[PDB]
Amino acid sequence: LTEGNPRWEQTHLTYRIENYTPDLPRADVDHAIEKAFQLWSNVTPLTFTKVSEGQADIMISFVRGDHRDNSPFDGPGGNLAHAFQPGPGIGGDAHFDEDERWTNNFREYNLHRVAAHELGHSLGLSHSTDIGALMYPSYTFSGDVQLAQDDIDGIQAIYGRSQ
Numbered sequence: 001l002t003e004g005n006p007r008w009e010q011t012h013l014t015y016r017i018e019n020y021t022p023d024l025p026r027a028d029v030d031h032a033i034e035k036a037f038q039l040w041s042n043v044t045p046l047t048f049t050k051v052s053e054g055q056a057d058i059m060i061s062f063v064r065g066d067h068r069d070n071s072p073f074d075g076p077g078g079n080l081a082h083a084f085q086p087g088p089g090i091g092g093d094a095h096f097d098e099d100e101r102w103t104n105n106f107r108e109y110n111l112h113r114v115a116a117h118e119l120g121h122s123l124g125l126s127h128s129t130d131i132g133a134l135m136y137p138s139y140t141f142s143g144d145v146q147l148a149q150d151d152i153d154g155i156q157a158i159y160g161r162s163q
């Protein structure tokens with residue numbers, strides 16, 4: 001028990017995509033989520049393994065409206081997605097608003113870009129004030145999805161560096 005955010009004490013985590021969005025072909029959803037994990041994996045000693053059945057540290061799903069938690073979704077626009085901080089059960093899980101039009105290109109809203117942000121929460125990060133950072137509280141799409149120095153510093157402060 002220390003201060004700051006809750007973190008995972010395990011370094012090898014598993015994730016599972018519970019349901020898929022009909023907005024994109026299955027392969028593009030898998031790619032977007034795998035690439036998002038890779039970003040954070042590149043700068044820390046964390047590893048992620050995808051499971052098809054059973055429980056996993058990070059469960060991912062596409063839902064709309066009221067979905068059994070205290071923050072029901074709001075239809076197109078507004079809130080795009082949310083995630084829980086590390087911990088048992090629902091901890092680390094990420095929920096994406098299905099009422100949004102998810103994309104695999106530059107048009108709103110790029111799944112990969114939003115997933116990268118949500119997984120940061122799943123790993124224990126809070127928001128950044130840097131408008132160039134992935135953890136910024138609002139959606140921005142620059143044309144590429146990469147960690148800003150602010151994102152790299154924040155995740156390394158918790159789990160350390162890689163190599």
Ligand SMILES: CCOC(=O)[C@H](C)NC(=O)[C@H](CC(C)C)NC(=O)[C@@H](CC(=O)NO)CC(C)C
Pocket residue numbers: 077078079080081082083114117118121136137138139140
């Ligand atoms: C430019 C502003 O409006 C927009 O472009 C779109 C419509 N909405 C948003 O960007 C809203 C903004 C809030 C002010 C409602 N933010 C989010 O949905 C965050 C929620 C979060 O923190 N999840 O972890 C998710 C990430 C994609 C940043």
Ligand SMILES: [Ca+2]
Pocket residue numbers: 056057058059087088089090091092093
């Ligand atoms: Ca969990």
Ligand SMILES: [Ca+2]
Pocket residue numbers: 073074075076077078079080097099100
């Ligand atoms: Ca919404």
Ligand SMILES: [Sm+3]
Pocket residue numbers: 021023097098099100101102
């Ligand atoms: Sm949709």
Ligand SMILES: [Zn+2]
Pocket residue numbers: 067069071082095
């Ligand atoms: Zn939710």
Ligand SMILES: [Zn+2]
Pocket residue numbers: 117121127136137
């Ligand atoms: Zn956020």
